[PDB]
Design a protein around this nucleic acid. Structure first.
Ligand code: MG
Ligand code: MG
Ligand code: MG
Ligand code: MG
Ligand code: MG
Ligand code: MG
Ligand code: MG
Ligand code: MG
Ligand code: MG
Ligand code: MG
Ligand code: MG
Ligand code: MG
Ligand code: MG
Ligand code: MG
Ligand code: MG
Ligand code: MG
Ligand code: MG
Ligand code: MG
Ligand code: MG
Ligand code: MG
Ligand code: MG
Ligand code: MG
Ligand code: MG
Ligand code: MG
Ligand code: ZN
Lengths: 23, 154, 60, 118, 127, 97, 83
RNA sequence: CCGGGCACUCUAACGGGACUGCCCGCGAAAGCGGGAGGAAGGAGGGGACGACGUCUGGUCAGCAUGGCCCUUACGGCCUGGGCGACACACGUGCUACAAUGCCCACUACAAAGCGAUGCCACCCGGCAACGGGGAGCUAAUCGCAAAAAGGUGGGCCCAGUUCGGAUUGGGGUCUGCAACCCGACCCCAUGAAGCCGGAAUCGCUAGUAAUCGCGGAUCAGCCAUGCCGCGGUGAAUACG
C-alpha cells in the first residue's frame, strides 16, 4: 500500500523518487 | 425533513438499453466514485447471462428485481415500556430501492472469486426462485406477517 | 527575557543557522511572514487599518 | 534442505519461492535469476536438476544467509549492548532504538498493554 | 460551410465545428473511440446528433481542453447541441425538452476553514 | 518598444494605461492596445484571535494587476514626450524593447 | 549520517588534547563537552569525562567503540522505572 | 515553428441579464400551486458580514496597561542537557486487514499556486537518494511539473499471501559549525500486529458524501499522516 517505500504508490505518497519510481 | 417532501432524483437512462433501472443498479454496484468499473462489472454480468440461460439479459434482470421486491416490512416503535415491530406497506420507490440493495449485497456475499460472475449468478438465481436476496425478502415478509396483531399501532 | 531576545535576534550570530526571524512590531518569534516581516496578529491589526497597501479582505 | 538448508514452496514461481529464504528478498530473487539464466515464470516443481544445482551453488556462494546471517545480526546487537552504547541500553530494555516516541504507541517493542490503576 | 458551437462544463471547454461529411468525428486530432478509449458514457456526447436525425450526416471537428474526460464529454455534448441549433432555429425543439442546450453550473464547492472538506466536519466528541 | 505597467489598484492602473494609449496617438505609431495580463493573487490566512482559537480564521489577499502597451513605430517625437507624464504613485512602470 | 565526501568531525579542541597527550605523558583525565565529537583510534586508551548536561561521566575507550560519538556513552536521562 | 488573423478558447475591465417580470387557478391582501420562455425561476449556488446582551468565558506568554514583587539577581552571556522520558489512560488522525484487489510496463486528461544566498531544462556518473557540467527564466515567455484515480496489456489465484509495512541489522546521500540524546531521503536484508473491530459513538442532503492526486504559508533541513487551498471521478436516501 501507500506505506511501502519500495513501490510506485509508496514513493508517490512520500513524494520522492528512486529505483521504484524513476524520473 | 420537517418542512417539505424530498424531491426524488431522476437518473439518466443508461446508454446501452435506455433503462434507468440499469443505471440505479450500477449506482448500487459502484463505490468510491468508480462508475466505469461498476458499468463494466454489470456488462460482464450481462454477457455471462447471455451465455447461460440464453434469454434476454434485460428480461432476467427485471425478473430478478420483481422477485426480490417486498410488499411488507416491519418498523420499530416504542409504546409504553415495550418495543413493537409494526407491519407497514412499502411504496414502489422503496420497493425498488430495497430490491436493488438486497440484490447487490447478496451478490457480494457469494464466494465466487470475481465480482462479474457473482452479480450474474445472483441475478439468474433471483430470476427463478432462489438466492440470498429472495431469502431476505421472505424473512422480511414473514416478520411482517408474524406481527399482524400490532397493525393498529401505526 | 523579551528586550534582550529581540536585540539578540537583531544581532549577527557566529553561525548562519542561528539567525531567525522576529516580528518587527511586537517582537514575536512565531508566525512571522517574510513578505511583511510582521506576525499574524500585527498583520491583521495593520490590515484592518488600511495601512497595508493593496491588502484587502479576501472572499471567493 | 533444498536451498541453503530450506524448502522453497512448490506450485509457485521461482522468484516468488526464493524470497522464502532468510536473507533473500525480491531484489536478490531477481538478481539470482538474471545471473543463472533461468526463467522466473517457471514453477519450482518444473526445474531441470542442472538449474537447481547451479542456482543453489550461486545463491550459497553469493550471499550470507539463514543461520550465519542470524549469528551476524545477534553478534552486532551483542556488540552494541556490551560497550554501553545508547542503542545498546535501549536493546537491553526492549525499547525503540531509532528514536521513536514512547509516551504512546511503541507496541511492537513493548508487547501487549499492561494496564495499571490510575 | 462550418457551424460553430462552444461548450463549457466543469472546468472543461470544447470548441465544435460541424461540416457536411460522411460523419467522421475527430477530437484533438485523434479519433473519438481512441481519445475516450474504454469509457462507456462516451456515446452520450452524441445524444443531440441522434434526437435530430443527422447522426451520420455531419463531420465534427472538436478541440477540448481543461477539466476531465467526463467533463469534456458533457462540454462536447453542449457544444454540439449549440452548433446544431445554430444550423437552424427549428432545431430548438427536440433539444430544449431534453435539456441539451442548457449549461450545467454545478462546480466543486470551495473548502472552508474548520472543515476537512467543503462540508465534512471534524469528528466530534463531548468529553 | 514595450511598456509593462503594474499596480495594486486596477482603477488607477487602467487610467494610466488609457492615458498612455491616448497620448501615444498624438504622433501615431500604430499603437497596440493596452492588454491585460493575468492578475497575480497572494493569499494569507490568519487565526482571528491572539490565543488558542484555531478554528476561526480570516483571509486576506493582495493582488497585482498587469497591463501591457506596445507601439509599432518608435515615434521619437512621441517617445520623448512620454518622459514627463501623469503617473499615479501606485502605478509602477517599466519600459523595454 | 555524515557524508564520506566530508571528513569525520572532531571539534579540534579535544583532538588537540589527545594529540598533545600522545607525546607528553600520554595518560590523564580530560573533561570535555563535545558530545558530538567522534571517537578516533588515537583516542583509544584515554579516559574522557563527557558532560551529560549535569555531570562528567568517565568513559574508557576501547577498540570496538571507535566509530561512535562520545555522547552515546553518557546517558542523559535517568529512568529506573514506574513505581 | 514562421508569415498572417483576432474567427474561437482564454485573459481583465466595463456592461446587460432574473425582477413573481408574463399566462391559468387559489386568496382581502401578502402570497401559494401550475405553465411558457430563458444559460439561469422563485433567496439561482457559495462567501464576506454576527443585534441588546450572556458566559466572574480565553489571553498580563503577541502587544499595551493599574497594583505587587526582584535589583553583583527572580536581570544578562555561553556550553551542554531538557521541552523527544514511559508500568499506563484518553482525544484527533494516517496506513491496512484485500481479487470492485495488489504489482509491473506503456499511454491520456486539470485547477489554483510558487520561483534571484531562487526555480532549475537538458547531458553525463551511481540501481538510487544524489552529484558534475550547464541553458532559460527577475517570469501568460523559462522551471517546479510527474498529475493520480483512469485506459490498454501481462503477472499474482484465496494464502497472513506478489495482502499489510511496523520493528531491527547493514551500506549510503543531503542540509547544517554540528544529525548521540534528537533530522529527512535512497538501496540491501528483516517482514510484527492486523481476517473488518464490545458496550458505544461521528460526519454528511448534490457536484455534497466517498475516493484520487496537486499547490501554498512557516522553513538551512525537517520529524506535515497537521493546516489553509485546488481540481479529477462521482453516489445513496429523506416515507415522516
Ligand atoms: Mg433543513
Ligand atoms: Mg531568566
Ligand atoms: Mg531558521
Ligand atoms: Mg520566526
Ligand atoms: Mg526472504
Ligand atoms: Mg475535492
Ligand atoms: Mg474580439
Ligand atoms: Mg475566570
Ligand atoms: Mg486560566
Ligand atoms: Mg505583560
Ligand atoms: Mg501586568
Ligand atoms: Mg511539545
Ligand atoms: Mg523519544
Ligand atoms: Mg482533540
Ligand atoms: Mg483513533
Ligand atoms: Mg500512516
Ligand atoms: Mg507479503
Ligand atoms: Mg505489500
Ligand atoms: Mg538530531
Ligand atoms: Mg497474529
Ligand atoms: Mg484472509
Ligand atoms: Mg465516545
Ligand atoms: Mg441542510
Ligand atoms: Mg496523523
Ligand atoms: Zn507582531
Amino acid at each position: 500500500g501507500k506505506g511501502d517505500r519500495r513501490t510506485r504508490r509508496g514513493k508517490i505518497w512520500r513524494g520522492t523518487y528512486g529505483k521504484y519510481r524513476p524520473r | 425533513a420537517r418542512r417539505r417532501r424530498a424531491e426524488v432524483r431522476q437518473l439518466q437512462p443508461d446508454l446501452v438499453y435506455g433503462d434507468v433501472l440499469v443505471t440505479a443498479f450500477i449506482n448500487k454496484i459502484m463505490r468510491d466514485g468508480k462508475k466505469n468499473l461498476a458499468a463494466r462489472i454489470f456488462y460482464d454480468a450481462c454477457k455471462i447471462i447471455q451465455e447461460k440461460t440464453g434469454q434476454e439479459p434485460l428480461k432476467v434482470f427485471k425478473q430478478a428485481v420483481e422477485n426480490v421486491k417486498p410488499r411488507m416490512e416491519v418498523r420499530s416503535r416504542r409504546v409504553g415500556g415495550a418495543n413493537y415491530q409494526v407491519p407497514m406497506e412499502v411504496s414502489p420507490r422503496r420497493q425498488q430501492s430495497l430490491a436493488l440493495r438486497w440484490l447487490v449485497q447478496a451478490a457480494n456475499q457469494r464466494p465466487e472469486r470475481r465480482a462479474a460472475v457473482r452479480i450474474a449468478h445472483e441475478l439468474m438465481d433471483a430470476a427463478e426462485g432462489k438466492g440470498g436476496a429472495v431469502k431476505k425478502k421472505e424473512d422480511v415478509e414473514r416478520m411482517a406477517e408474524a406481527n399482524r396483531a400490532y397493525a393498529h399501532y401505526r | 527575557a523579551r528586550k534582550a531576545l529581540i536585540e539578540k535576534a537583531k544581532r549577527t550570530p557566529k553561525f548562519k543557522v542561528r539567525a531567525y526571524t522576529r516580528c518587527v512590531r511586537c517582537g514575536r518569534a512565531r508566525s512571522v511572514y517574510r513578505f511583511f516581516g510582521l506576525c499574524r496578529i500585527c498583520l491583521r491589526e495593520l490590515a484592518h487599518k488600511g495601512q497595508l497597501p493593496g491588502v484587502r479582505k479576501a472572499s471567493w | 534442505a533444498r536451498i541453503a538448508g530450506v524448502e522453497i514452496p512448490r506450485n509457485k514461481r521461482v522468484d516468488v519461492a526464493l524470497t522464502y529464504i532468510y536473507g533473500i528478498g525480491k531484489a536478490r530473487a531477481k538478481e539470482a535469476l538474471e545471473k543463472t539464466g533461468i526463467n522466473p515464470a517457471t514453477r519450482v516443481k518444473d526445474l531441470t536438476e542442472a538449474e537447481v544445482v547451479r542456482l543453489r551453488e550461486y545463491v550459497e556462494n553469493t550471499w550470507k544467509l539463514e543461520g550465519e546471517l542470524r549469528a551476524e545480526v545477534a553478534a552486532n546487537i551483542k556488540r552494541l549492548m556490551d560497550i554501553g552504547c545508547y542503542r545498546g541500553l535501549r536493546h537491553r530494555r526492549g525499547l525503540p532504538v531509532r528514536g521513536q516516541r514512547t509516551r504512546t504507541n511503541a507496541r511492537t517493542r513493548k508487547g501487549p498493554r499492561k494496564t495499571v490503576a490510575g | 460551410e462550418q457551424y460553430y458551437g462552444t461548450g463549457r462544463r466543469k472546468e472543461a471547454v470544447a470548441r465544435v465545428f460541424l461540416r457536411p461529411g460522411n460523419g467522421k468525428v475527430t477530437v484533438n486530432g485523434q479519433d473519438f473511440n481512441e481519445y475516450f478509449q474504454g469509457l462507456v458514457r462516451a456515446v452520450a456526447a452524441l445524444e443531440p446528433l441522434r434526437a435530430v436525425d443527422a447522426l451520420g450526416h455531419f463531420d465534427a471537428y472538436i478541440t477540448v481542453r481543461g477539466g476531465g474526460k467526463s467533463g469534456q464529454i458533457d462540454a462536447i455534448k453542449l457544444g454540439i447541441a449549440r452548433a446544431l441549433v445554430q444550423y437552424n432555429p427549428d432545431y430548438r425543439a427536440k433539444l430544449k425538452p431534453l435539456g441539451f442546450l442548457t449549461r450545467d453550473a454545478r462546480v466543486v464547492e470551495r473548502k472552508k476553514y474548520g472543515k476537512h472538506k467543503a462540508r465534512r466536519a471534524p469528528q466530534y466528541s463531548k468529553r | 518598444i514595450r511598456i509593462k505597467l503594474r499596480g495594486f489598484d486596477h482603477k488607477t492602473l487602467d487610467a494610466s494605461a488609457q492615458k498612455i494609449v491616448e497620448a501615444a496617438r498624438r504622433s501615431g505609431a500604430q499603437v497596440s492596445g493596452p492588454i491585460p495580463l493575468p492578475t497575480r493573487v497572494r493569499r494569507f490566512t490568519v487565526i482571528r484571535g491572539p490565543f488558542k482559537h484555531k478554528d476561526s480564521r480570516e483571509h486576506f489577499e493582495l493582488r497585482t494587476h498587469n497591463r501591457l502597451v506596445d507601439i509599432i513605430n518608435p515615434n521619437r517625437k512621441t517617445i520623448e514626450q512620454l518622459m514627463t507624464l501623469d503617473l499615479p504613485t501606485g502605478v509602477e512602470i517599466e519600459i523595454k524593447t | 549520517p555524515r557524508s564520506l565526501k566530508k571528513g569525520v568531525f572532531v571539534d579540534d579542541h579535544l583532538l588537540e588534547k589527545v594529540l598533545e597527550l600522545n607525546a607528553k605523558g600520554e595518560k590523564r583525565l580530560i573533561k570535555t563537552w563535545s558530545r558530538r565529537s567522534t571517537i578516533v583510534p588515537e583516542m583509544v586508551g584515554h579516559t574522557i569525562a563527557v558532560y551529560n548536561g549535569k555531570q562528567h561521566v568517565p568513559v574508557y575507550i576501547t577498540e570496538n567503540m571507535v566509530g561512535h560519538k562520545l555522547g552515546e556513552f553518557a546517558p542523559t536521562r535517568t529512568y529506573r522505572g514506574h513505581g
